Design a protein around this ligand. Structure first.
Ligand SMILES: CCCCCCCCCCCCCCCCCC(=O)OC[C@H](COP(=O)([O-])OCC(O)COP(=O)([O-])OC[C@@H](COC(=O)CCCCCCCCCCCCCCCCC)OC(=O)CCCCCCCCCCCCCCCCC)OC(=O)CCCCCCCCCCCCCCCCC
Ligand SMILES: CCCCCCCCCCCCCCCCCC(=O)OC[C@H](COP(=O)([O-])OCC(O)COP(=O)([O-])OC[C@@H](COC(=O)CCCCCCCCCCCCCCCCC)OC(=O)CCCCCCCCCCCCCCCCC)OC(=O)CCCCCCCCCCCCCCCCC
Ligand SMILES: CCCCCCCCCCCCCCCCCC(=O)OC[C@H](COP(=O)([O-])OCC(O)COP(=O)([O-])OC[C@@H](COC(=O)CCCCCCCCCCCCCCCCC)OC(=O)CCCCCCCCCCCCCCCCC)OC(=O)CCCCCCCCCCCCCCCCC
Ligand SMILES: CCCCCCCCCCCCCCCCCC(=O)OC[C@H](COP(=O)([O-])OCC(O)COP(=O)([O-])OC[C@@H](COC(=O)CCCCCCCCCCCCCCCCC)OC(=O)CCCCCCCCCCCCCCCCC)OC(=O)CCCCCCCCCCCCCCCCC
Ligand SMILES: CCCCCCCCCCCCCCCCCC(=O)OC[C@H](COP(=O)([O-])OCC[N+](C)(C)C)OC(=O)CCCCCCCCCCCCCCCCC
Ligand SMILES: CCCCCCCCCCCCCCCCCC(=O)OC[C@H](COP(=O)([O-])OCC[N+](C)(C)C)OC(=O)CCCCCCCCCCCCCCCCC
Ligand SMILES: CCCCCCCCCCCCCCCCCC(=O)OC[C@H](COP(=O)(O)OCCN)OC(=O)CCCCCCCCCCCCCCCCC
Ligand SMILES: CCCCCCCCCCCCCCCCCC(=O)OC[C@H](COP(=O)(O)OCCN)OC(=O)CCCCCCCCCCCCCCCCC
Lengths: 206, 96, 106, 57, 243, 318, 346, 35
């Protein structure tokens, strides 16, 4: 006996209210305990008052009793289960004994791995996309427009587009309205997108 | 002691109390509550004579209700959400 | 809770006992169902003072043609699914026992 | 886990119906054994509010 | 939250605890009525006390103001069709709400028609009353109620009538007016409901006026002087004119 | 990555000392109660270990806090020994920062975009932390004893009423200055482990999340969470052993479980409680370290960015 | 260099993608001052309206408990006229208006500001519906957790004042008003008096804010097809969405607040330990694992719905009006939408 | 089979079936039962 394992003596053990009245360590395997039976005097009186004219039953006045927590599932005993399942190789005959206690009963174990089970979709998708950088390393990064005339004019065409917008034809097209207004301004060596463009400024070249 | 068969005060975990947790006034209020939990019954102030209003000297019948409840209570404390009132109330919504 | 008169129940089913009638009245059934259950229980010999569980749902004592009284137990059943059937050995509704081998001895 | 059938998958007979009803009522009573009655719950709900300004009518 | 102190909350908790500890499921009542005459119970151990055909005796189709409610549907439909007010699409579509809500009060009235007691029996012991009613669709509902849960209402139906001195029976024994009684707890179709008002129509024969009045006023009837009549006149699902 | 650093501006020694002292002062003032609760939980669990099962395995920091507050001392009761804790923390920070900056200046690479490897930085930080902890051990001992007084029986309490008072009492009653260095080895080990188990994981996860999601603001704080968790995982056993050694009273009869050294304490802990016993108060330790690191990093980054902007560095160089 | 952990700063090279939109770009209007101002405005207005409604309802109930409830329109009109002139009603209006100001400024404003801060940058799809809404779930959860405990101190102060008002003169603090009580409690009982056993309020606030803000933001974009293709009334659709959001918030929040009644108000079985040991967290776990919902959903409307839902509905409407739920939408084939214009017409 | 001997090397011809540190073959290397 060790008081450290006794909840009554050891106050550091946090009792679980949802498991009150249920002790997995006391189960039979196979379970052969009766914990439910006829219950009266809660709402239905145990005595007889069918023909009592001076007594009327009021079920509304139900006195509160102790909460009946739902039965807790059995918890595994690691050493006992390992010994029970253990079989000696070239010493034991291959047979099943008459006693039913030899049945391999399933008992619940640690719940830690079930956290990873529950988070598996998040973990699996993260491994698929973020860990492997699928489809490419740039899809999940915050998007930044290319710097001014970067990487080359043939691809960027910022200066030519600016000149076209500032030209007579660009102004006339903007007036027609088929083409939207210019979205960036070429500052002193840098391109700055207007706040209404709804995009981030280009990343610095370092 | 080293042996764990019987408990020893060396492992006792109880912090000493030096004063009320929330003040002497709070302690006095708690003591008064314990002494007169039911004997002291303050009530909100309401006028006792109103011309238009009719004093409520009796329990009113169900025919005075402007609204009909849907849920109900079993006499054993169970709360019924499915009731004949709900059955009749769900017909228009389901039809639509 | 509208318990029916045990005397009336006994009158309707002459052979039933006062204790059985009172227990039936205590049971939460409408008076008509209480009377019908009393009739069925008396006629079959079923013991109403039996708490149904997952092993047997009821028990009865019946005198066979040889004059001997024998006990007949109504087993808890399942709908074409042994997996759903609760294999237990306690008077408990909860499915506490889990078996890796459905047929231990084959 | 607890089976919803309580050991009576089919009500092929009124006796089976009665047995299922009896055990279902007993189980419901046991499950509801730990909560207050209708009167207590209703009074608590009705008089939950305790925030007033002027007292001593 | 519990550390905050409130005298109203403390009084509420004390009242709840005191109620739970004091009032028990079993209660003592001295309201016992002993009928002068011997009671002749049916073969089923019950005595009939009230009979009526509320569906037969009530107006079902042409009832006010439900006729008024339903007469406006063509007006709304015509308004939506022809848009006489030159409204926008959503505004005109808003006129189609009324046809989908106009018939609800008639449904509620038809439902209420099924709460008028069709048949009433008193069981052995004078503590249980069985009330049988039907809906306009022919469904038959029977419910058992303990006698103490009855509370008669005034003729105006706006207040609780004094249980002791209630004047709702004529000298011969019939009802002066359509009586209303509130059942504190009614178990209908295996569901318990609170404060359900039911009615006994004036155009309905009242058998055993003493027993009917005792049940209405909530007295427990003493059935010591009883006889049993073996008459199997009523069959299961028997037809009647309450259709 | 070896050229991904941007050390374009380095604060002077005086600036480093002043900023570190002020920021550590405010951080310790903010996060002291968590450390108090952690120490009290370790003391109360000493000699028994974790006896709950599954989700309840451990000691509830909220429960410990509520029990401490129920004593009637209010929130001021959670700052008992705060003067000693602050003095010890300030001395440790001063010594460690001075030594680390001196060595870093001596052995820094010439290029501004190159920095010492994580291994070399960890070696320097561990040496500096060990030296500082060895020098400032008595303050930590006094603070831990003051914290554990409340948990321990009144007859076993020491009744220290300040850092200087505790130092004098230890020197006189126990005799000799050697009594002031009890648990110094454990403190040095804890300091070394904490120094080496923080900078690595932070940069690891910060760079990885930058590669994944690019440049964002939540990256620093996610990396901070990761680094704090792993630092707690690495250091908590040493903190527990140091707390046990400090709480060990001079008299064996007063001691509930006497220890002769770091190894002896570890052996006793393993014997009387599983290896899980080293991680009592893990939630409290994690919260304490995360809050301290977050506040320190936030204030230091704000001040450093302001100073860099005043100097005139480019946006990317900051 | 400063302490044990080093915040290493690193430089990185340029990187860009084809599309510059539909990701995270912080809106220009998302600033500490502007978001705080808008959130404070919306929260203050919503709290004022909610507290006025609660005071009116409670005074109506108080008057009805002593006088028969209205029987017709004229009786209802005179009942309201007499309620409006009650001294208790006026004092409640004043104190709860102060409480509304405080809470709308320090809890609802904080919630709105944090939500805007963490969700302003999530752009939407042009000529389409914002997919990948899961990206917003962490942001809303972060905001809900951060801003959950911002109302518990004010609520505890209000409860302490209303419970002080009901003690004898000797044991009464004598708080002049709610603001006076709020200023005095921290120094008299201590700061922890306003935070002890705050789990019910904290979880209630978390569920409210999360399932309200996130659900409204989700719906206002996903159900937008009603007015974008079906030509339905946008304002009516938004009102319906806000109603659904507030109803869901009330449903998800009330069960956690029910822990107050079970732990403290439910009668205790003599000679037996408390079922939940006086722990609101354990009571909440029991509610979560309970089989029957109605048992802890009893009293949903008479207790919490009409005290919470109208405020949340008004908060959502005002936030939408000011622009706390407005996202930026730009064409992905426009000039700034993508960096590859050669395939936008070909 | 580590620091705990459960099986019987007397009845087991070879003790190398499972990892262990507490079993030894009865017929060791170099042992040859010969008539
Ligand atoms: C660091 C991780 C980082 C994050 C990523 C993690 C990714 C994980 C995989 C994700 C998907 C599955 C997640 C399921 C987790 C929950 C399992 C569960 O139900 O609880 C245990 C549960 C036991 O508890 P219980 O049923 O509640 O009650 C019994 C009591 O435990 C009492 O039981 P007892 O009396 O029998 O005592 C023993 C009990 C006591 O110990 C414990 O319970 C400890 C906690 C559980 C540990 C589980 C794994 C242990 C290591 C397995 C290694 C292989 C076997 C070699 C020997 C290992 C010895 C330790 O231990 C067990 O029962 C463990 C048995 C596990 C058997 C594993 C081999 C099964 C075949 C593989 C099928 C699945 C294939 C998936 C991949 C497909 C790829 C195409 O066992 C099962 O139900 C069996 C599940 C077996 C399959 C799933 C788990 C194995 C996953 C292997 C890795 C797959 C990787 C694939 C992706 C990456 C590839 C590189
Ligand atoms: C950005 C937009 C913003 C817009 C503006 C917003 C401004 C703020 C608005 C704030 C509103 C606050 C409302 C608070 C009410 C508090 C009630 C309360 O505590 O009840 C406790 C009550 C329990 O109380 P108890 O003490 O246990 O009752 C026991 C008595 O035995 C049993 O009770 P009793 O029979 O003795 O009852 C006495 C009766 C009090 O006695 C009377 O009823 C006498 C007065 C008779 C006249 C009735 C009103 C006449 C017309 C004026 C309407 C003004 C309404 C203004 C409020 C509107 C918003 C709610 O009290 C009541 O039952 C409540 C009366 C309230 C009026 C209800 C009817 C409103 C119809 C509205 C029609 C449209 C008007 C349009 C106006 C134009 C502008 C919008 O439990 C509940 O909470 C149940 C309420 C259930 C209500 C809904 C019923 C139908 C549900 C079906 C679904 C329909 C909705 C579908 C979804 C729609 C949304 C997606
Ligand atoms: C089986 C294990 C398997 C591996 C896993 C490990 C698990 C471990 C835990 C669980 C198992 C139980 C433990 C078993 C440990 C076994 C090893 C062992 O023996 O270690 C014990 C060893 C010592 O334990 P101990 O017996 O408790 O001794 C500590 C006493 O408690 C200290 O007493 P104190 O606290 O009262 O100290 C007072 C202070 C009293 O102060 C004095 O020393 C006084 C005399 C000197 C005063 C002057 C100091 C200098 C200042 C003046 C300078 C000159 C003047 C300058 C100008 C004027 C101004 C100042 O004394 C000291 O300084 C310390 C004692 C030595 C003093 C004598 C002279 C030493 C000179 C050399 C050092 C100099 C620098 C020291 C400071 C550090 C640098 C800053 O502990 C350790 O090594 C710690 C654990 C192991 C760490 C290494 C990690 C290995 C594992 C690697 C991973 C493996 C993974 C793979 C698995 C492998 C499986 C095999
Ligand atoms: C931003 C992060 C976003 C992350 C998003 C993540 C999304 C995915 C996951 C979502 C789910 C996460 C769930 C988390 C675990 C929850 C576990 C649980 O339910 O049990 C915990 C705990 C259970 O404790 P217990 O032992 O069962 O006690 C039961 C009693 O009913 C209740 O226990 P009690 O009454 O003993 O304890 C009440 C607690 C109440 O504490 C509070 O009200 C403070 C807020 C945190 C409380 C969290 C509980 C305590 C945790 C340990 C210590 C936390 C330190 C502070 C927070 C940082 C570290 C986490 O009181 C204290 O611990 C002491 C308060 C100190 C006195 C007042 C002075 C405050 C400081 C004032 C000066 C500094 C600030 C102003 C000046 C600034 C400079 C100008 O329950 C709670 O306290 C509430 C849990 C509610 C769960 C629903 C989700 C909401 C969670 C809110 C927590 C965070 C609030 C915001 C602060 C942090 C960010 C800035
Ligand atoms: C049976 C047991 C025998 C025990 C004794 C004999 C064996 C002893 C073995 C010791 C091993 C020590 C390992 C340290 C950790 C290394 C981790 C590692 O390499 O991770 C990869 C990383 C590699 O970092 P990196 O610099 O290459 O860059 C990382 C970034 N990338 C990947 C992009 C390049 O190393 C670290 O993060 C190391 C951080 C810690 C460094 C400091 C270690 C401790 C130094 C102590 C110095 C002395 C203190 C004072 C002592 C006073 C008393 C004497
Ligand atoms: C695998 C090869 C290595 C060699 C062989 C293996 C030998 C070592 C085996 C160690 C087993 C694990 C021991 C710790 C178990 C803790 C269990 C637990 O959670 O207890 C409850 C405690 C209780 O903490 P609490 O007191 O805060 O309680 C809070 C919990 N409630 C609210 C429920 C009370 O929980 C924790 O501490 C959770 C985190 C546990 C983290 C364990 C880390 C162990 C690391 C050991 C080695 C050092 C790190 C090295 C690697 C990283 C750095 C490089
Ligand atoms: C059913 C499950 C899957 C559900 C669908 C998920 C689809 C996307 C893949 C995500 C997988 C993990 C779950 C994360 C959900 C919330 C964050 C998210 O979805 O990230 C998207 C968003 C950036 O995406 P966005 O830029 O908007 O994309 C369009 C750009 N033109 O990013 C953000 O908003 C920033 C979020 C930062 C934090 C993310 C943390 C993710 C961690 C995942 C697990 C990692 C495990 C690694 C294991 C390593 C083992 C060695
Ligand atoms: C979006 C498709 C994918 C999602 C799942 C779809 C499931 C379909 C199941 C069938 C029943 C739902 C009705 C069909 C889907 C919704 C309507 C739709 O697809 O939008 C188009 C529809 C008609 O528009 P159309 O005439 O084609 O536009 C041409 C413009 N020149 O536009 C309309 O007329 C608008 C009608 C909106 C009705 C929405 C009902 C379902 C949403 C939940 C209930 C909302 C209740 C409140 C509605 C308030 C409206 C004011």
């Amino acid at each position: 006996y060790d008081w450290r394992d006794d909840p009554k003596v050891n106050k550091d053990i946090e009792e679980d209210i949802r498991d009150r009245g249920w002790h997995p360590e006391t189960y039979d395997f196979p379970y052969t305990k009766k914990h439910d039976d006829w219950v009266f005097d809660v709402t239905m009186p145990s005595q007889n008052y069918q023909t009592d004219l001076t007594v009327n039953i009021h079920p509304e006045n139900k006195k509160m009793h102790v909460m009946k927590q739902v039965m807790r599932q059995s918890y595994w005993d690691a050493e006992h289960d390992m010994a029970h399942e253990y079989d000696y190789e070239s010493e034991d005959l291959d047979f099943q004994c008459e006693s039913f206690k030899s049945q391999h009963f399933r008992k619940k174990g640690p719940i830690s791995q079930y956290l990873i089970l529950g988070l598996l979709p998040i973990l699996y998708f993260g491994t698929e996309f973020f860990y492997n950088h699928y489809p490419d390393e740039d899809y999940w990064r915050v998007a930044h427009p290319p710097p001014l005339d970067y990487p080359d004019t043939d691809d960027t065409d910022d200066t030519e587009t600016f000149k076209d917008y500032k030209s007579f034809t660009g102004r006339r097209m903007v007036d027609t309205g088929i083409v939207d207004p210019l979205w960036y301004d070429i500052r002193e060596g840098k391109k700055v997108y207007y706040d209404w463009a709804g995009v981030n400024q280009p990343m610095e070249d370092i | 002691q080293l042996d764990f068969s019987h408990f020893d005060k060396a492992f006792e975990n109880k912090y000493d109390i030096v004063a009320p947790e929330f003040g002497d006034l709070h302690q006095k209020r708690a003591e008064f509550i314990a002494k007169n939990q039911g004997t002291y019954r303050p009530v909100p102030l309401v006028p006792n004579n109103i011309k238009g209003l009719i004093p409520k000297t009796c329990r009113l019948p169900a025919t005075r209700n402007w609204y009909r409840r849907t849920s109900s209570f079993e006499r054993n404390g169970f709360f019924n959400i499915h009731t004949p009132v709900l059955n009749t109330k769900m017909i228009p919504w389901l039809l639509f | 809770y509208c318990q029916m008169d045990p005397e009336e129940i006994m009158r309707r089913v002459p052979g039933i006992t006062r204790k059985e009638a009172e227990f039936i009245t205590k049971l939460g059934l409408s008076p008509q169902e209480q009377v019908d259950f009393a009739y069925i229980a008396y006629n079959i010999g079923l013991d109403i003072f039996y708490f149904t569980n997952q092993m047997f749902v009821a028990r009865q004592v019946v005198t066979n043609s040889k004059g001997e009284k024998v006990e007949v137990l109504w087993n808890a059943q399942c709908y074409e699914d042994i997996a759903q059937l609760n294999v237990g050995f306690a008077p408990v509704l909860e499915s506490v026992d889990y078996h890796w081998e459905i047929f231990l001895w084959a | 886990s607890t089976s919803t059938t309580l050991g009576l998958p089919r009500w092929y007979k009124r006796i089976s119906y009665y047995i299922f009803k009896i055990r279902y009522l007993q189980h419901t009573k046991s499950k509801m054994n730990g909560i207050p009655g209708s009167t207590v719950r209703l009074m608590l709900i009705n008089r939950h509010f305790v925030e007033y300004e002027v007292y001593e009518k | 939250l519990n550390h905050v102190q409130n005298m109203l909350e403390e009084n509420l908790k004390y009242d709840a605890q005191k109620y739970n500890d004091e009032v028990a499921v079993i209660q003592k009542t001295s309201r016992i009525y002993k009928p002068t005459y011997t009671i002749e119970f049916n073969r089923e151990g019950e005595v009939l006390v009230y009979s009526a055909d509320p569906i037969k005796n009530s107006v079902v189709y042409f009832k006010y103001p439900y006729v008024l409610y339903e007469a406006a549907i063509p007006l709304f439909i015509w308004a939506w069709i022809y848009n006489p007010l030159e409204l926008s699409k959503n505004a005109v579509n808003s006129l189609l709400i009324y046809p989908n809500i106009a018939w609800i009060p008639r449904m509620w009235y038809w439902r209420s028609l099924q709460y008028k007691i069709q048949k009433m029996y008193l069981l052995r012991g004078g503590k249980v009353a069985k009330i049988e009613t039907q809906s306009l669709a022919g469904d038959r509902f029977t419910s058992w109620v303990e006698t103490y849960q009855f509370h008669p209402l005034t003729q105006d139906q706006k207040n609780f009538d004094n249980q002791d001195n209630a004047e709702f029976l004529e000298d011969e024994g019939q009802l002066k007016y359509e009586l209303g009684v509130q059942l504190d707890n009614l178990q209908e179709m295996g569901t318990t409901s609170q404060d359900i008002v039911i009615n006994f129509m004036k155009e309905g024969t009242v058998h055993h006026p003493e027993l009917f009045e005792a049940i209405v006023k909530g007295y427990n009837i003493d059935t010591s002087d009883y006889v049993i009549n073996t008459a199997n006149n009523l069959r299961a699902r028997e037809g009647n004119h309450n259709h | 990555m070896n050229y991904s650093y941007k050390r374009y501006w380095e604060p002077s020694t005086a600036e480093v000392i002043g900023l570190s002292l002020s920021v550590n002062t405010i951080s310790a003032a903010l996060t002291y109660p968590i450390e108090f609760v952690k120490v009290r939980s370790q003391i109360r669990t000493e000699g028994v270990g974790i006896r709950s099962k599954n989700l309840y395995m451990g000691i509830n920091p909220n429960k410990v806090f509520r029990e401490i507050h129920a004593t009637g001392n209010g929130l001021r009761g959670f700052y008992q020994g705060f003067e000693s804790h602050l003095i010890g923390r300030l001395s440790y920070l001063f010594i460690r920062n001075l030594t680390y900056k001196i060595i870093y200046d001596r052995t820094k690479p010439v290029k501004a975009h190159n920095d010492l490897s994580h291994r070399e930085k960890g070696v320097i930080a561990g040496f500096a932390g060990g030296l500082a902890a060895f020098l400032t051990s008595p303050a930590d001992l006094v603070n831990t004893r003051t914290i554990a007084e409340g948990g321990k029986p009144k007859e076993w309490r020491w009744g220290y009423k300040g850092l200087m008072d505790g130092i004098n009492k230890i020197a006189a009653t126990e005799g000799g200055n050697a009594a002031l260095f009890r648990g110094s080895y454990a403190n040095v080990l804890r300091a070394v482990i904490l120094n080496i188990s923080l900078t690595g994981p932070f940069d690891y996860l910060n760079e990885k999340i930058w590669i994944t999601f690019g440049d964002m603001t939540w990256n620093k704080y996610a990396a901070l969470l990761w680094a704090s968790f792993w630092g707690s995982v690495a250091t908590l056993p040493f903190d527990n052993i140091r707390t046990r050694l400090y709480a060990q009273n001079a008299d064996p009869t007063k001691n509930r479980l006497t220890y002769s050294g770091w190894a002896d304490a570890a052996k006793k802990l393993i014997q009387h409680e599983g290896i899980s016993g080293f991680y009592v108060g893990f939630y409290a330790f994690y919260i304490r370290t995360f809050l301290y690191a977050w506040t320190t990093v936030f204030i230091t980054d704000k001040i450093t960015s302001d100073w860099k902007r005043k100097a005139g560095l480019k946006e990317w160089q900051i | 260099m400063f302490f044990e952990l080093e915040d290493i700063k690193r430089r990185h090279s340029l990187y860009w993608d084809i599309y510059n939109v539909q990701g995270w770009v912080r809106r220009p209007d998302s600033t500490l001052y502007n978001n705080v101002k808008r959130g404070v405005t919306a929260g203050v207005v919503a709290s004022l309206v909610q507290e006025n409604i609660t005071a009116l309802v409670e005074n109506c109930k108080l008057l009805a408990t002593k006088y028969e409830k209205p029987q017709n329109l004229r009786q209802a009109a005179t009942f309201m006229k007499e309620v409006f002139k009650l001294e208790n009603y006026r004092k409640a209006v004043w104190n709860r208006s102060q409480y509304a100001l405080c809470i709308g400024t320090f809890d609802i404003g904080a919630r709105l500001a944090t939500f805007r801060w963490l969700n302003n940058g999530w752009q939407r799809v042009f000529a389409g519906f914002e997919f990948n809404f899961v990206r917003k779930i962490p942001t809303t959860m972060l905001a809900a957790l951060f801003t959950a405990p911002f109302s518990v101190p004010f609520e505890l102060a209000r409860m302490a004042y209303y419970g002080d008002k009901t003690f004898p003169k000797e044991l009464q603090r004598g708080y002049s008003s709610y603001l006076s009580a709020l200023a005095r409690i921290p120094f008299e009982e201590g700061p922890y008096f306003l935070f002890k056993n705050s789990f019910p309020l904290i979880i209630r606030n978390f569920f409210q804010t999360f399932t309200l803000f996130y659900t409204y933001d989700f719906l206002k974009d996903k159900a937008s097809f009603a007015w974008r293709v079906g030509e339905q009334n946008e304002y009516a659709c938004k009102m319906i969405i806000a109603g659904i959001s507030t109803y869901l918030a009330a449903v998800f929040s009330y069960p956690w607040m029910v822990t107050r009644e079970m732990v403290d108000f439910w009668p205790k079985v003599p000679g037996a330990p408390c079922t939940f040991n006086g722990n609101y967290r354990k009571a909440a776990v029991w509610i979560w694992y309970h089989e029957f919902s109605g048992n802890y959903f009893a009293g949903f409307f008479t207790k919490y719905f009409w005290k919470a839902s109208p405020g949340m509905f008004l908060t959502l409407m005002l936030a939408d009006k000011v622009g706390l739920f407005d996202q930026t939408t730009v064409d992905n084939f426009g000039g700034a939408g993508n960096n590859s214009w050669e395939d936008t017409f070909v | 089979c580590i620091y705990q001997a459960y099986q019987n090397p007397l009845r087991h011809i070879n003790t190398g079936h499972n990892p262990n540190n507490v079993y030894e073959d009865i017929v060791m290397l170099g042992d040859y039962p010969v008539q």
